[PDB]
Amino acid sequence: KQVEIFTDGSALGNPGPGGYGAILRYRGREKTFSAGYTRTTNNRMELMAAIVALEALKEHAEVILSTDSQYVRQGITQWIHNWKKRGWKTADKKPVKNVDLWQRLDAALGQHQIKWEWVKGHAGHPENERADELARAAAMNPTLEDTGYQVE
């Protein structure tokens, strides 16, 4: 009884309009999530896609989460454990970039058993390609304010 999640996010500027797409599959069926923000970044949308998909889980699960985001992979596999040791601050004592979303992702995660699948390209990954199409459509017609976005 595993849940398969496929996520992607993108933006059209640095900061610009952006959006996310997430696909959840469980016991044969599929659910889709997508929303666009007026001023955000690619990395924030890559993170938001995973957050929204995991927050949709209403009971503890065994999850296989597939994403091609290098940023999410680096946070999960390289950075988050050390950021927690340092109180979510860098060496210059500033809050970690996108700390709001990393902390929200950590809350959305830790209740589930997650196997991360770090995919590279779209070839052979149709759900990831569709998640990208959803994110791009959302970026072309954004409705929400990414209140946590901060310059730099």
Side-chain angles (χ1 to χ4, degrees), residues 3 5 7 23 54 57 61 87 97:
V3 178
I5 293 178
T7 65
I23 296 157
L54 292 163
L57 303 175
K97 179 160 60 50

Side-chain angles (χ1 to χ4, degrees), residues 18-151:
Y20 64 78
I23 296 157
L24 310 206
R25 191 185 311 155
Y26 178 51
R27 202 67 229 157
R29 303 78 201 298
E30 211 161 273
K31 206 177 292 78
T32 307
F33 303 89
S34 182
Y37 294 81
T38 58
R39 180 180 168 77
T40 190
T41 66
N42 275 274
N43 288 166
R44 286 179 70 79
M45 292 297 93
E46 291 161 31
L47 215 42
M48 189 72 157
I51 290 168
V52 169
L54 292 163
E55 289 177 346
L57 303 175
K58 299 308 293 175
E59 66 160 0
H60 316 153
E62 287 192 29
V63 177
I64 304 298
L65 200 161
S66 296
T67 181
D68 70 359
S69 174
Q70 176 179 235
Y71 185 65
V72 176
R73 174 175 63 78
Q74 291 190 254
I76 292 294
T77 69
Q78 304 170 355
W79 302 333
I80 296 169
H81 57 267
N82 288 315
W83 284 338
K84 287 173 178 184
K85 292 172 162 36
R86 303 173 191 193
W88 293 93
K89 304 292 182 185
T90 35
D92 53 18
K93 289 290 191 177
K94 285 197 282 74
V96 162
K97 179 160 60 50
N98 297 326
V99 61
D100 62 318
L101 296 183
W102 284 113
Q103 288 181 147
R104 184 176 170 191
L105 177 59
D106 198 54
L109 294 166
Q111 200 185 350
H112 303 294
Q113 293 170 52
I114 307 165
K115 175 184 174 82
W116 297 85
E117 290 187 2
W118 309 120
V119 301
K120 275 128 54 216
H122 281 160
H125 296 99
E127 299 92 345
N128 295 88
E129 168 48 358
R130 187 161 66 83
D132 181 57
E133 295 214 313
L134 287 161
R136 290 185 286 102
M140 295 186 299
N141 275 324
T143 55
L144 309 172
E145 178 184 286
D146 184 0
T147 309
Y149 169 72
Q150 291 171 156
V151 183

